[PDB]
Design an enzyme around this catalytic site. Sequence first.
Site, PDB file in Angstrom:
ATOM      1  N   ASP A 458       0.846  -1.182   0.000  1.00 41.77           N
ATOM      2  CA  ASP A 458       0.000   0.000   0.000  1.00 41.77           C
ATOM      3  C   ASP A 458       0.894   1.248   0.000  1.00 41.77           C
ATOM      4  O   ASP A 458       1.872   1.314   0.766  1.00 41.77           O
ATOM      5  CB  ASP A 458      -0.866  -0.041   1.261  1.00 41.77           C
ATOM      6  N   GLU A 495       1.741   0.022  -4.882  1.00 44.10           N
ATOM      7  CA  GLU A 495       1.232   1.254  -5.466  1.00 44.10           C
ATOM      8  C   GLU A 495       2.354   2.280  -5.489  1.00 44.10           C
ATOM      9  O   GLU A 495       2.707   2.834  -4.456  1.00 44.10           O
ATOM     10  CB  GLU A 495       0.116   1.830  -4.601  1.00 44.10           C
TER      11      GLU A 495
END
Length: 870
Positions: A458, A495
């Site tokens: 993340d 990400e």
Amino acid sequence: AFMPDARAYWVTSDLIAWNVGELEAQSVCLYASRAAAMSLIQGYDSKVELQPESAGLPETVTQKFPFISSYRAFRVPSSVDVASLVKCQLVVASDVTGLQLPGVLDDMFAYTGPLGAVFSEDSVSLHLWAPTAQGVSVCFFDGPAGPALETVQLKESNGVWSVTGPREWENRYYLYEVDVYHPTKAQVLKCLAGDPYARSLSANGARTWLVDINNETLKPASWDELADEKPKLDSFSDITIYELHIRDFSAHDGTVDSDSRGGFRAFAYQASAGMEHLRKLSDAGLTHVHLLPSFHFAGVDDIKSNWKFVDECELATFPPGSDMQQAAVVAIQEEDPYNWGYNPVLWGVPKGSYASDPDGPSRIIEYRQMVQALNRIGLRVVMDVVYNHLDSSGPCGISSVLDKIVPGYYVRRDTNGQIENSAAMNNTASEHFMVDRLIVDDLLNWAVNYKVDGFRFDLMGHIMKRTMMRAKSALQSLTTDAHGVDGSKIYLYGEGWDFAEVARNQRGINGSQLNMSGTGIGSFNDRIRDAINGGNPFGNPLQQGFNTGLFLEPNGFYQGNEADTRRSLATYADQIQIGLAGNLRDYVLISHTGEAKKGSEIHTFDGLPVGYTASPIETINYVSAHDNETLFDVISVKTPMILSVDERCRINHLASSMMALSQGIPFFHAGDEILRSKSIDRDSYNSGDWFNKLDFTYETNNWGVGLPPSEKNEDNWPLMKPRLENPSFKPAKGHILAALDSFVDILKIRYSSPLFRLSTANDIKQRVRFHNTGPSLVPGVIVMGIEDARGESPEMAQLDTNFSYVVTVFNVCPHEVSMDIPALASMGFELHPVQVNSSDTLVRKSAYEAATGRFTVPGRTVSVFVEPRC
Ligand SMILES: OC[C@H]1O[C@H](O)[C@H](O)[C@@H](O)[C@@H]1O
Ligand SMILES: [Ca+2]
Ligand SMILES: [Cl-]
């Protein structure tokens, strides 16, 4: 009262940085008070003058903290007991301000010895890094609810507080009592905190369970043999990913016992509709399941007796475009069993709400049983790791742990000393040594103690590149003989978004898409996502793309004149083809203008390279994920309203097939394959089971269950309402099952030829060609050829024993096309055997004519042609 900010930095034992002027610099002093008793400076225990350092800040400092590289430097005299001072309230005065201490804390106290609980035959020891603390004690309890039985003092050495006790301490519960200066309150406060290195917890992390993670009773049957039983993975190039939430998987699954729905145990129901579904996908070729956050996160109470539920019978009676369903869900959304879990408290412990019993060992053994169950149906397990921010900070509250113990260190701060919030509040500072340490140690915990097969990071752009690379090395060096796991097969991706305070490498080289090029760590390819779907999740919802009707089937939203939409469609086709070829910097495409361009020379709207990777394994190709609208919902919004759901079903298949037949690593959102809807919720993290339903009976897809929650969606309700109310938008079971069958077949096709999964950039550049290019291209068609060795004296290795060539035609036009490719004339192409035998009658009509090299492909269809070797 006295409440200074913190504009100065204590960066090394002998240097302070502060951005004052030259005359101001000629009289700076440092003031300390152990009791935090200073006033506006009065009430100090000590003062010392800081002599300006004309040389300024050294390279080591400016490399570590680029954003302060221009600050004036001040020398701390050798007379100063730094270890004592960092435990005090500190200010510097010229103007008065506090000091940000991480630099000096790393310089003096960086520690590589044991942390957390260490077990030996006759002892248990505890170790806590807390160099700013004035004192640390441990409170022991005999269970999760009892009173304290005893308090023991820890002793500090080199910033680390430790105590050793007898083996009988095993399985006690405990908390640390940490006396430490908290800048947010300008006071020395006694804080009760769990262990950062916890391996288990009582409900809601209230106490740390002093469990030996190697205990035999925590191991499922055959646990130590799991490495031998794990699915083979020859190459990272063979990976496909399916992104799934643990509660979504079984919350509605009637084939799982009522009391075992929603958690880790549901995965042990091998014959359940959910596990049969996963087995079907795995058999077709799916390799990896990415589970949403499953460590100790805030936002769901681990105590199940506090869970609230909507009346799902009453809500089913409400109109499909009503706002009443969401009002009911939202009324209890802070007290229901549901959250995606992106709210970190303690990284190293399984989430208690997903365990049968949040006290004791069940969370450990049930997590292991889940990994084992998935592995046994041919699926490797990826964890969604969230190292970029914390749920909470500060001295108080059950959800703050790291910042209770070493305040202002684990969290990143601005130049005034205020915590940075760009990564969903309380951003971490992986640039600091012990933060980096905790991140890498946590990854190794999950890899070794839980035999996890990969990690999705993340907000990886908020993590230092050096942290990512140190983790990668440590993980991939694990061996079966030494650690019980083959680290060489552990895959990392994330990400790589670049924004806010980490942009322009301002806090160091961060884990952005561009910076991770050449690392072998994957990142989400947003360029292919946006080119296929149209626009961007935060742009106008009606902006069309290659697969949602731009130019070919206008939806009535004004997007320019015909020539402009035609060119915009062709531009998106360029971006898609770069992505289909692994999203490489160096891959050369004939662009829509006719000009040959490298992937890096085709640009985003912000002038950055479309193709940014050095290897296909660096590319995670996707059109959908848990964030933003589902694949079905984005298609239902952007396509013309008049299309039938049958037509939209084919469009869903086109999108997931572009992923499934791409070079690089395809990523699928759970539900892509079954037309999953959230009734157009764009951000369903707290929208409950109602909006997040996954129905493995295949009777519903969850379209038309009310307008989604107002907080994130109300501005778009007017476009949603007539679509949700229209019966022609809702698929039936037949459509859902048809989508599933064609998804299975396209996976079979990917795994039928190694040509779809080339392992290097050189292979792609040599073998992959696109055949419908330039200003006169046929709009709405991509033709992709992949060559293998053929003839005598070939200039490449033979990768495929069955096929010498593969050609894929993606036709998004609502009509048949005939694509003439003279380069592919007089060859032995036939329709892929999977498609010859397809349950879809339309794809069977696809044909090749040798004399002309003509490929005839029906509307809204992906057709795959092979040249057989036998
Ligand atoms: O909201 C974040 C978005 O901002 C901009 O529109 C960028 O073009 C896009 O890449 C990014 O995702
Ligand atoms: Ca909730
Ligand atoms: Cl209504």
